[PDB]
Amino acid sequence: ALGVVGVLESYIGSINNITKQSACVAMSKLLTELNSDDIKKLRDNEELNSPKIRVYNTVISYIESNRKNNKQTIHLLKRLPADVLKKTIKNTLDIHKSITINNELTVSDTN
């Protein structure tokens, strides 16, 4: 029984017998845990027209959908084509690596 991140990574890679249902439940937990205010800091630090801006805004929208309608957002994730779900999860795992911390905080200067 892996944790949230391990379950999601397993689903992306089609290993450890993780089902789409378990992945979407775990994804909902990850979206709850992620701090959307910190993602907005990352987004605002991008140069304008950076393709990352759209990614950050997608994860931000999914956090808001998950916060309003938890179980419907899980169903929405289950309805997504597998390849679209996996891209959304991968982007969300990437943001998790960038913002998880015990904090107020700033954004790094390197590029």
Numbering used by the authors: 73 to 175, 178 to 185
Task: Tell me what the authors wrote about this structure, in their words.
The HRSV M2–1 RBD crystallized with two molecules in the asymmetric unit. The structures from both crystal forms are virtually identical in the core region (residues 58–177), with a root-mean-square deviation (r.m.s.d. on Cα atoms) of 0.3 Å. The structure of the monomeric domain is superimposable with that of the tetramer, but uncovers additional structured residues at the C-terminus that have not been observed previously. A notable exception is the C-terminal region (residues 178–185), which could be clearly modelled in one monomer in the P3221 crystal form. In the tetrameric HRSV M2–1 crystal structure this region was disordered and thus not visible. The C-terminal tail observed in our P3221 model could be extended in solution and would therefore explain the lack of globularity in our SAXS model. Electron density for this region has not been observed in previous crystal structures.
The M2–1 transcription antiterminator factor is a basic protein of 194 amino acids that exists as a stable tetramer in solution and is essential for the complete sequential transcription of mRNAs in HRSV. M2–1 oligomerization is primarily driven by a central tetramerization α-helix and is also stabilized by contacts between the zinc-binding domain and the core of an adjacent monomer. Given the relevance and uniqueness of this viral transcription antiterminator, we set out to investigate its RNA-binding domain (residues 73–194) using X-ray crystallography and folding thermodynamics.
